[PDB]
Design a binder for these strands. Sequence first.
RNA 1: AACGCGACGAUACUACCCGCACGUUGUAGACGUAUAAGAAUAGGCUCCGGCCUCGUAUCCUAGCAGGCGAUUCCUCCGCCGGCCUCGAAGUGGCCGUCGGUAAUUCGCGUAUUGCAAUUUAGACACGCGCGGGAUCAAAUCCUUUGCAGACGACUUAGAUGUG
RNA 2: CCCACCCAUACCCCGCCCUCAGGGUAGAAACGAUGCCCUGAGGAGUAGGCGGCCGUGGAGGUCAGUGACGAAGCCUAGGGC
RNA 3: AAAGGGAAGCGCUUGUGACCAGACUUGCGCCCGGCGGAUCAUCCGGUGUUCUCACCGGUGCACUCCGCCGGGCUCAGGCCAG
Lengths: 108, 126, 203, 126, 171
Amino acid sequence: PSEAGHRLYVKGRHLSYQRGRRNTHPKTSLIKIEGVDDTAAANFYLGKRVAYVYRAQKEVRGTKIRVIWGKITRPHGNSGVVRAKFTHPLPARSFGASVRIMLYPSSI
Amino acid sequence: VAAKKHVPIVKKRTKRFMRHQSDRFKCLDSAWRKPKGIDNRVRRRFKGNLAMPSIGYGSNKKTKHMMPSGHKAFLVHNVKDVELLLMHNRTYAAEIAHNVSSRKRIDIITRAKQLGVKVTNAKAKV
Amino acid sequence: SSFESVVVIDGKGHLLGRLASIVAKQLLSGQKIVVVRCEALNISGEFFRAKLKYHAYLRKMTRYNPTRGGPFHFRAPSRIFYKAVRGMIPHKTARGAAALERLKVFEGVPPPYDKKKKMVVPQALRVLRLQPGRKYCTVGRLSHEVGWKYQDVVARLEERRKAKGAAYYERKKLAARQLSEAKKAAAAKVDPKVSEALAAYGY
Amino acid sequence: KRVVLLKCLDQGVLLVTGPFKINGVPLRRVNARYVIATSVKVDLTGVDQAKIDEVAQPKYFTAEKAKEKASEEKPQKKPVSSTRAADQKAIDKALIANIKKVDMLASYLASSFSLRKGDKPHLMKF
Amino acid sequence: VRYAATEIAPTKSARARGSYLRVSFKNTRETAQAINGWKLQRALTFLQNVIDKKEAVPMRRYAGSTGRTAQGKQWGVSRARWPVKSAQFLIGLLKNAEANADAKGLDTGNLIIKHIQVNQAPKQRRRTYRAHGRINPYMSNPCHIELILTEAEESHLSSRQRGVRIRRALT
RNA sequence: AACGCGACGAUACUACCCGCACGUUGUAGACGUAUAAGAAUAGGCUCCGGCCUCGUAUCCUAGCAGGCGAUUCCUCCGCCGGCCUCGAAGUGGCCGUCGGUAAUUCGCGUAUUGCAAUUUAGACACGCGCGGGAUCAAAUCCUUUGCAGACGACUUAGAUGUG
RNA sequence: CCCACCCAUACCCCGCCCUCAGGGUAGAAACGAUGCCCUGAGGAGUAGGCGGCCGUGGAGGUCAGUGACGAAGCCUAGGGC
RNA sequence: AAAGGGAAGCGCUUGUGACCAGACUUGCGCCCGGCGGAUCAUCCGGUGUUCUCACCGGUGCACUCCGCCGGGCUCAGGCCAG
């Protein structure tokens, strides 16, 4: 049989919200995408959809898994950190949580 | 019937303005009171404190006093009062008064179903 | 930038503050970090300066009751590294505690980390950071002088682990050689079209 | 999955096929924003553009959708119509005929794409 | 009269009540919390042991600056006492409830104390004399006791989700 | 350390162990969540030919989330049993059996989830179940002791006896 | 010295609210004209000054007002403005 | 039912669990077929009015009107979205 994987997304880590030294704006999140280190590398992923996946307690419509969706808006800084805007702001417990950056909508 | 076409109803703020220390004293009601002390932090508008009501929170004039269904409430006590909404079944919804008896409620609900006007709490006393 | 399940770092030849800052950033980002051999960790400057710093740290204690609230002086090199890491982390927050539970520090290389691949951090290496002629000290030596009792036990455990690693080294050398003549013997039976296409593509 | 584009429809829609005997993907529609275009181009000398136009014609895939859903509601496999089957055969016969000329292209189009460690899509060439 | 536990029907349950009883509210509350959820005969035996200085009621809430004993280890605490007056009052109420249960015809040996509630009765207003011509209240704090014994005893799926369920059902 | 750890003895049950049968069971958060020399840096590695900025590397990676049947190959993986071996917080090596296995080629199926909607897929611990294998124990209240003690707590003794 | 980056209620655009300002609306198919329509600028605030609304008890008029088929009152992790 | 490692309470923002208010259940307009009736338009007499407009009775007699029942077609209809 096949011994291959099935990953068609790219991994990321959710760092924090858009913030100053004290004030924090959860309307925009900061992500590392795996393997990007430069603003030019992060310029590819602008406009790509992004999904954060978590588990709940109750069973609704055949699933215990909920997804919050968003898109990558603009680069941040110089180290390839990207800004993401979602339909709902991310939980603050998700600092250090893995997120799935899609390959679509593609311009290739 | 269905409400008339309107702009999207937007609410600038949905959380109620609480009185300062109304959560700490049971002698203080949750109704809004302006702090008038010269050194009160809410009055001096320090960050992290309670906001005050202002005229910047006022909702749109086109969506003013409108329910999310797109209707404006009209308090009704009798059949002659619900007949006043013969022209506004697309913008006005009848709200039955709390002290109206059950038979009069049934008569008003029947007349309102005839007129095609929405009753907000027509499931009352059934 | 590569995400791993857990990253094992040999503590030998590393600088305390720079390594601590790097691993603290990794822990707060969400990367699980294990640091081994904290006895071979390095601090720049002359050794009597570090002795001044640790004895000044020893001076502090709660006056009315030393059993509560006071600065508790952990003499182990791994615990000194843990204090340096913790000072760079908001440890009194729930996020800080949930990051600190992702860190483990040890003296020597306890099993089964002895049979796992160890990373090194170039941004904290002494040979890549310090100028020649500048003095340096050993965290293990400082710990031994300030009261850490287990220098010789770690020494003999590391000696036996190095003997076993040497045995694994001649096994690995034998495997590497016989793989080399395996590839050389198989090279005669490779299809020439496969050879040319692989050479053109880059293997 | 790895498909071959037949022609570009309107409003971001592409009309593709597997072919069906290689990987199992029939005549289908996708969107241009949800695909990655590779450098491999299957040659189309021998495919019938009349049937390509008929399958690209609208209401082809949705004319019997309601009827099929009402028929479907032990599980049973949904019947594929003879028009779809004959059209798929007429498109893909020349498709495998052209594909088998290029070496291991059938294995490529049968294989599904997956990402391994170190695969950076901003550096990968498609 | 209405009890606090209105959910329990009186068809297969027994009840007992006592009002304006000159017994300490705190001690009675602790004894009720000690005997709550118990078999009736075990509760009667335990209350007799509380009188006979053999089993102790643990002092849980109203326990400030109270004594410690070896008999609290049966409860996992260190502070426990013997409120014999509350014990006597509760045996009186429990025997009244047992008598009511026998009058109803229920099985006495299968009854457990499902409900028991002690509330603060109106207080007895005595006075005491202090220094400097002062008078302070010397009030008693009575309690209302009530108790009840009972017999011991995939929709709105998406089209794609429907499809994956059909396919894994087929295969 | 009363929220540090180790070893040992006895463990009644709804307790313990084994198999599979799944969780409106929980997890600072799986998606190939792959990769062991030591040492030096004004020096090292080796097959002893030579090599060293470079991990930009190596392994693995194709098939209904990966089927069925041949052609073909003796390659890889896994569960058990034996012999060794592994104490820094203990696990790996060989042999034997069994099972799976495109390295080459071909045949039948894939549709209809309707133009994207997490790809519900892993690990640990926990719980309810059966079908089996193994075992019939302690502690506290009580009496007593004074090597102890405000009370708790501590040292003792209570089952046939040197009580 | 050079390069890039982070962010305030600070500045630009847009929406909304209020205040102020500037305009139009009758041989009226004609308006809570005390109304409606268009455009622009500004929005902190103690002592202080001014305006508009909300609520409480009672009186005249009116709603051929509500009500034992339940008024007032009270409770309400239940709602709307 | 829930939280608690030397305070709680509070603002913004998610998440978790529990509980709920809206909206929708189809309407509008044609083309057919089948029903049930003549409240069609003209003319006449009377009545009241805005003095040219309506009502009433004679008035239709089925290619005209008014309702109902089956279809078909067009349009507009709630939320989240590409």
